[PDB]
Amino acid sequence: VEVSGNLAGHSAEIEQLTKTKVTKMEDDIKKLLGRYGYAYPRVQSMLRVNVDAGNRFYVRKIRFEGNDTSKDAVLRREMRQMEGAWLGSDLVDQGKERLNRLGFFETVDTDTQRVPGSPDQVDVVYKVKERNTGCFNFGIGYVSFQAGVQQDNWLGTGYAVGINGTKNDYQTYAELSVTNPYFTVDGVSLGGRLFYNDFQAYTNKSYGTDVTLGFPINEYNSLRAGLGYVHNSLSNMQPQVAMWRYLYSMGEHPSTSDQDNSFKTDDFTFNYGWTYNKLDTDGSRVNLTGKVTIPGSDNEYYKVTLDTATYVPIDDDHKWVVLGRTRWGYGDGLGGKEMPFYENFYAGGSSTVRGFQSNTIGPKAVYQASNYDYECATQDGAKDLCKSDDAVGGNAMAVASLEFITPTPFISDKYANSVRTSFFWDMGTVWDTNWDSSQYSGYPDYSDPSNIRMSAGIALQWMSPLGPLVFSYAQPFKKYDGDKAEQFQFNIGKTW
Amino acid sequence: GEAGAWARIMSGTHVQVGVDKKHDLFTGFTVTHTVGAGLYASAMFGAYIDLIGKYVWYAGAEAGYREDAWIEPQAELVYGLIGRTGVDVGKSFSGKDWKVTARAGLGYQMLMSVGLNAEIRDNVRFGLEFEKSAFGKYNVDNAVNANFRYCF
Amino acid sequence: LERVVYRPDINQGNYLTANDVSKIRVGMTQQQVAYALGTPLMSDPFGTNTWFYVFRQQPGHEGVTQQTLTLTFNSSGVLTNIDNKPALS
Amino acid sequence: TNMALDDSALQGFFGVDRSDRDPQHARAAFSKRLVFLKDRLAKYEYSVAEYYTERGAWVAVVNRVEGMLRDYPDTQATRDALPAYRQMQMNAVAKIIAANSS
Amino acid sequence: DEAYLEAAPLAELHAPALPVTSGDYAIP
């Protein structure tokens, strides 16, 4: 191709990119040159291409229209085109996209304006419309009450604030979480929360605080970590083998079947994590988190977690894509200690293996008052060796799934842009550490991870304004220890 | 929208899921696990008829007949034979910044019920339900339920 | 801490290149210079007939490089003198 | 005068300024009624200057400051707008700073 | 409502023993 005209010092790149295709090439040339100050180059072609690069252009002022609510400083946070600098169109489109990413608006638009005082001067104009920053949810019923307030952008000032106050008889709790995404001018975020909780019959009282600092390391990934602690006093809980092992290893030796007992700690920890952000049925997200105790803590323990998902197209026409998900993690105590009961986790339900009941996966309870039920675990009912069906959670777990998404406008839909139907297969396992299979031999070994529960079936993926309706059906394939199944599961997020 | 779906939890527990569509004509159906099911539809006849029938163990159906205020006598057929026979009342209010529906009714198995459904032209929304009853097949002493929503 | 935190690129001032600055001569008029170089971004707040140009770049997570140009004009808009600071001190 | 666009129930109740919100409506409002607008607008320009001062785009700030000095000689911002750019060697400036000190 | 009542004086800065000025937004 012959290249001529008022060529820029970057004409090497014109030849490199060039050597409806001609129109596209011309637009790609204009796109290139728009990064070097040429706001309005013009290219004609016959192949011969005649490029009139034009002059270099500068932006005199950047102003916003339509924001009568939030601080001016907020919108300027995501610009890459600087005032008193040469124009680069990508620096403006990236700004628009970052604003669209944050979502602090009802509408966004952009334009480019000419300065009447000089043909080589331009302005950049952004226009926005805004919607609600968040809501206040209040409700009482015959007698319990819950209310809270949340905003993503407090009074348009840049802060995220959430207040949760729940009052009941069996349990009362509260949480306050406040974060400043811009503690410093470079976008370093800092925030934290205070909380209180409890439980009435076992009984528990707890409260604490956690403050986390985090910052970006590149365009889309970020790192966070911080410090906090929780006070947790647990009492009036039925003593059991999971609890007997946990407490006894610490020196705590409550009487057998003596439910009127207590143990409380002030546990101080360090929390951390990091996130991968591949955004888009494509893209991926990786959240790697964990926490450890500090020497000032009453208990000593560690926990590690992982939660990831990745879209992997299968067909080259994008008519078949598999979305994989993995959940994984475990923790235990330090120095001879075990993981505290209230720091232990459950697995199971429509979020884990869709064929099994909620919070069903893993080891079961093994073992004071009586009004006659569960007599073997009590002191007034019966004194015997109990083998219950009630899950106690575990110390380590892994979960995985594959979701197979195809278009279906030729089976049951016309648009396939609201609620999608997909096929999935999943698996997951939970097991204990420090399980003694020799004292309890007529019982499953609860440290064996190979007892993997798995299922497959069909799930819905809702995006519709109708709300977060979660419906799925799956059948389990494997059972090991009285596994309690539930093939059809659903709930609603009650939001959006 | 012209069509949609919902689910509800009913207890003093039954779980309902259902779907409906707006066509005055409005129709829909439910399936309720205790598994039962039922159908309903309502339309203008400013009088209306709202026909609801289901087997969920409850078995039966209700019907009635109803211009800014109304009186709507209702009765139901109960199989195997006590149900709600009575007359509902209510009134609609509106203004440039709001709409309110006031509902109430009286009947017997003594049955009394009230409620309020109100919306503001801004982010604020209100609602209230209450039922009271005596001397029939069930007795409600207190069923106060009230809430509201606000967004910034 | 600050020295390892990610930062977007900073671009300030006008573009400069030897191809244009080496072409500026005493006796050249403001209209000719403005054509050759482009519209000035800075001027004297008190109306002194002089132009200033600044080319400043600081890549993200890096240091800053800046060059300046000073143009002294007479009362007719004809350049009388010129200076340049190729780098910061 | 459409001053309704410079307030709200929430912004009013908590006693906070609206000067760093879109000022174009106040300009339309411009048409001693102008003293308030003079300062409400100058505060906007000042706040923008501060944003870029912290961010470091001080050349654009200097041009904005000259705009403020030229167009609003009698506002408080004229002192507030005086300063990031001083890291560069400038033929300073000092005469006006001293002459109008108070 | 009363904020405008501050009525701060619109005194101009004097020149030192001359900045660029304009006539826009004039007070009549």
Element (H, E) at C33: helix C30-37
Helix pair angle (D33-55, D58-71), 10° resolution: 170
Which residues are A325's β-sheet partners?
A309, A401
- The A-side interface with B (CB below 8 A) comprises 132-142, 151, 155, 466, 469, 490, 492
Return the domain boundaries, chain C: 10-85
- Residue A149: both structure tokens together: 């307030």
User: With a CB-CB cutoff of 8 Å, which residues 9-68 of chain C face chain E?
Assistant: 45-47
Closest approach of chain D CAs to the CA of A155, in angstroms? 8
Q: Which residues neighbour A360 within 8 Å (Cβ) at sequence distance 6 or greater?
A: A348, A349, A391, A483, A484, A486
**Å between D30 CA and nearest CA of chain C:** 27
Tell which residue, A50, A64, A123, A143, has the closest CA to residue A99: A64
A118 touches chain C (CB under 8 A): yes
Which residues does chain C have within 8 Å of residue A37's beta carbon, measured at their own beta carbons? 15
* Cross-strand bridge partners of residue D81: none
**Angstrom distance (rounded) from CA A21 to CA B134:** 82
Q: How far is CA B42 from CA B26, B38, B56, B71, D30, in A?
A: 5, 14, 20, 16, 57
CA–CA separation, A229 and A195 (whole Å) = 10
Cα distances (angstroms) measured from residue B132 to each of B104, B112, B140: 11, 5, 5
Residue pair A8/A53 in contact by the 8 Å Cβ criterion:
yes
Cα atoms in the Cβ-side hemisphere of radius 13 Å centred on A374: 18
SS3 B36: strand
Take residue A385 and report the two structure tokens written for it.
Answer: 């060796």
CA distance A192 to B69: 52
Please tell me what DSSP assigns to residue C29. Answer: B
**Alpha-carbon distance B30 to A110, whole Å?**
48
Interface test with C, best of A57, A82, A215 (most C CBs within 10 A): A82
Strand, coil or helix: D4: helix
Which pairing describes strands A42-45 and A58-65: parallel, antiparallel, or unpaired? unpaired
- From residue C62, give the alpha-carbon distance in Å to each of A185, A410, C6: 17, 55, 10
CA separation for the pair A324, C48 (Å, rounded) = 68
- Nearest-angstrom CA–CA distance, C9 and B14: 60
Name residues whose C-beta falls within 8 Å of residue C8's C-beta, 6 or more positions apart in sequence. Answer: A80, C60
Q: Does C56 touch chain D (CB under 8 A)?
A: yes
Q: Do C45 and E20 touch (CB under 8 A)?
A: yes
Domains, chain A, in order of start with CATH, read 2-52 (no CATH), 58-129 (3.10.20.310), 136-492 (2.40.160.50)
**Residue at token pair 């944003």:** D51
- Decide: B49 and B42 in contact? Cβ < 8 Å: yes
What would you report as the CA-atom Rg of chain D, rounded to the nearest whole angstrom? 15
CB-CB neighbors (< 8 A) of D60 in chain A = 61, 82-84
Q: After which residues is chain A broken (C to N over 2.5 A)?
A: 19, 46, 142, 201, 280, 367, 372
In terms of Cα–Cα distance, which of C7, C8, C20 is closest to C71? C20
Q: Which amino acid belongs to residue A418?
A: S
Closest by Cα among A431, A250, A440 to A344 = A431
The CA distance from D6 to B72, in Å, is 50
Domain boundaries in chain B?
1-66, 68-152
Are A192 and A177 contacting, i.e. CB atoms less than 8 angstroms apart?
Answer: yes
> Are D78 and D69 within 8 A, CB to CB?
yes
Note whether E7 contacts D32, CB cutoff 8 Å.
Answer: yes
For C57, nearest residue in chain D (alpha carbons): D57
User: What is the C-alpha to C-alpha distance for residues A396 and A430, in angstroms, rounded to an integer?
Assistant: 6
In angstroms, rounded to a whole number, what is the distance separating the alpha carbons of residues A300 and A319? 50
- Whole-angstrom CA distances from A405 to A324, A452, A457, A487, A492 are 11, 25, 12, 20, 22
Our answer on whether D and E touch (3+ beta-carbon pairs < 8 Å) is yes
Pairing of strands B85-95, A321-333: unpaired
Torsion of CA A490, A494, A495, B4, to 10 degrees: 70
State how far the Cα of A136 lies from the Cα of A147, in Å rounded to an integer: 8
Task: Report CA-CA distances (Å) from B53 to B56, B58, B71, B80, C13.
Answer: 10, 11, 22, 15, 77
- Two tokens at A218? 């590149």
Neighbours of A94 (CB within 10 A): 17
Q: Are A14 and A64 in contact (CB under 8 A)?
A: no
For an interface test with A, give the residue of D5, D16, D22, D50 to mutate (most A CBs within 10 A).
D22
Q: Is A423:A314 a contact under the CB 8 Å cutoff?
A: no
Q: Which of residues 38-97 of D touch A (CB under 8 A)?
A: 44, 47-48, 51-52, 54-55, 57, 59-60, 63-64
- Quote the tokens at residue D14: 């908590």
Burial of residue C67, with CB atoms counted within 10 A of its CB: 0-12 exposed, 13-18 middle, 19 or more buried: middle
Distance (Å, rounded) from C-alpha A352 to C-alpha A326? 10
Return the closest-CA partner of residue B53 out of B86, B73, B34, B75.
Answer: B75
Topology adopted by domain C10-85: Beta-lactamase Inhibitory Protein; Chain:B, domain 1 (3.30.1450)
Using left for φ > 0, alpha for ψ between -120 and 50, and beta otherwise, residue C77 falls in left
User: What's phi and psi for D34, nearest 5 deg?
Assistant: -90, -5
CA distances from A377 to A251, A383, A388, A390, A482 (A): 22, 6, 10, 13, 20
* Nearest in space to A366 (alpha carbons), one of A339, A332, A391: A391
Give the C-alpha distances (Å, rounded to integers) separating A179 from A211, A213, B57, B107.
Answer: 9, 9, 51, 54
The yes-or-no reply on A/C contact (3 CB pairs or more, < 8 Å) is yes
- The answer to whether the CB atoms of D57 and C10 lie below 8 A apart is yes
Cβ–Cβ under 8 Å, residues B2 and B21: yes
- Long-range CB contacts (< 8 A, 24+ apart) of D16-22? D16/A155, D17/D43, D18/A68, D19/D43, D19/D44, D19/D47, D20/A71, D20/A72, D20/A73, D20/D44, D20/D47, D21/A67, D21/A68, D21/A69, D21/A70, D21/A71, D21/A72, D22/A64, D22/A65, D22/A66, D22/A67, D22/A68, D22/A72
| E20 touching chain C per CB within 8 A | yes
Helix (H/G/I), strand (E/B), else coil: B39? strand
Contacts of C49 in chain E (CB under 8 A): none
Chain A residues lying within 8 Å of D52, measured CB to CB: 76, 83
In three-state form (DSSP H/G/I as H, E/B as E, the rest C), the secondary structure along chain A is CEEEEECCCCHHHHHHHHCCHHHHHHHHHHHHHCCCCCCCCEEEECCEEEEECCCCCEEEEEEEECCCCCCHHHHHHHCCCCCCCECCHHHHHHHHHHHHHHCCCCEEEEEEEECCCCCCEEEEEEEEECCCCCEEEEEEECCEEEEEEEECCHHHCCCEEEEEEEECCCCCEEEEEEEECCCCCCCCEEEEEEEEEEECCCEEEEEEEEEEEEEECCCCCEEEEEEEEEEEEEECCCCCHHHHHHHHHCCCCCCCCCCCCEEEEEEEEEEEEEEEEECCCCCEEEEEEEEEECCCCCCCEEEEEEEEEEEEECCCCCCCEEEEEEEEEEEEECCCCCCCHHHCECECECCCECCECCCCECCEEECCCCCCCCHHHCCCCCCCCCEEEEECCECEEEEEEEEEECCCCCCCCCCCCCEEEEEEEEEEEEECCCCCCCCCCCCCCCCCCCCCEEEEEEEEEECCCCCCEEEEEEEECCCCCCCCECCEEEEECCCC
Which residue from A266, A259, A269, A217 is spatially nearest to A235, judged by alpha carbons?
A: A259
State the Cα–Cα distance between residues D77 and A417, nearest whole angstrom. Answer: 52
Report whether A85 contacts A61 (CB < 8 A).
no
Task: Give the Cα separation of B62 and A105 in Å (integer).
Answer: 47
Helices A11-18 & A21-33 angle (0-180, nearest 10): 150
Q: Could you tell me which of A24, A38, A23, A89 has the C-alpha nearest to residue A11?
A: A38
DSSP for B138-151? S--S---EEEEEEE
Which of A140, A142, A146 should one mutate to test binding to chain B, selecting the residue with the greatest count of B CBs within 10 A?
A: A142
Task: Using DSSP bridges, classify how beta strands B14-22 and B3-10 pair: parallel, antiparallel or unpaired.
Answer: antiparallel
**Any contact of E with A, at least 3 CB pairs below 8 A?**
no
Neighbours of A109 (CB within 10 A): 12
Cβ-contact A441, A435 below 8 angstroms: no
* Cβ count near A472 (within 10 Å): 20
- The answer to whether B53 and B33 have CB atoms below 8 angstroms apart is no
Interface mutation vs chain E, best among D7, D8, D34, most E CBs within 10 Å = D34
Question: Minimal Cα–Cα distance from A57 to chain D, Å?
Answer: 15
DSSP letters for D45-99 = HHHHHHHHHHHT-HHHHHHHHHHHHHH-TTSTHHHHT---GGGS-----HHHHHH
Q: What token pair was written down for A430?
A: 């939970």
Which residues fall within 8 angstroms of residue A184, CB to CB, at 6 or more apart? none
From the list D57, D58, D69, the residue facing C45 with the nearest CB is D69
Q: A79: distance to nearest CA of chain D, Å?
A: 11
| CA-based nearest residue in chain A for residue B143 | A142
Furthest C-alpha separation in chain D: 48
Please list every residue in chain D whose beta carbon sits closer than 8 Å to the beta carbon of residue C54: 59, 88
CB A473 within 8 A of CB A488: yes
Q: CB-based contacts of D45: which residues, under 8 Å, 6+ apart?
A: D64, D67, D68, D72, D77, D81
What tokens were used for C70? 């000073």
Contact E18 C45 (CB under 8 A): no
Q: Which pair of tokens denotes residue B107?
A: 């009947």
How would you classify the pairing of strands A321-333 and A301-313?
A: antiparallel
Q: In this structure, what token pair is assigned to residue A273?
A: 């994590």
Residue A391 falls in which region: left (phi positive, over 0), alpha (psi -120 to 50) or beta: beta
Are residues D99 and E22 in contact, defined by beta-carbon separation less than 8 angstroms?
no
- DSSP reduced 3-state for E27: coil
C-alpha–C-alpha distance, residues B110 and B124, integer Å: 35
CA distance A253 to A300: 18
Cα–Cα dist A257/A237, whole Å:
10
Interface test with D, best of C11, C14, C42 (most D CBs within 10 A): C42
E1, E18, E22, E25: best to mutate for the D interface, most D CBs within 10 A:
E25
| Cβ atoms of residues C55 and C66 within 8 Å | yes
The helix/strand/coil state of E4 is helix
* Radius of gyration, CA atoms only, chain C: 16
Reading the block at residue C4, the tokens are: 């390892």
- Whether the CB of D34 is below 8 Å from some CB of chain E: the reply is yes
Contact assignment for B152 to A137 by CB distance below 8 Å: no
Q: How far apart are CA A354 and CA A476, in angstroms?
A: 8
Nearest CB to E20; choose among D30, D66, D95: D66
Closest residue in D to A184 (Cα–Cα):
D54
Nearest to E19 among D34, D69, D74 (CB): D69
Q: What are phi and psi of A404, to 5 degrees?
A: -110, 110
Entry field: residues in chain E:
28
In Å, how far are A149, A160, A162, A252, B146 from A134, measured between CA atoms? 8, 10, 9, 47, 21
- DSSP tag of C78: B
> Which residues on chain C are in Cβ contact (under 8 Å) with D59?
12-13, 41-42, 54, 56
Residue E3: strand, helix, or coil: helix
Q: What are phi and psi of A92, to 5 degrees?
A: -90, -40
Q: Does D16 touch chain E (CB under 8 A)?
A: no
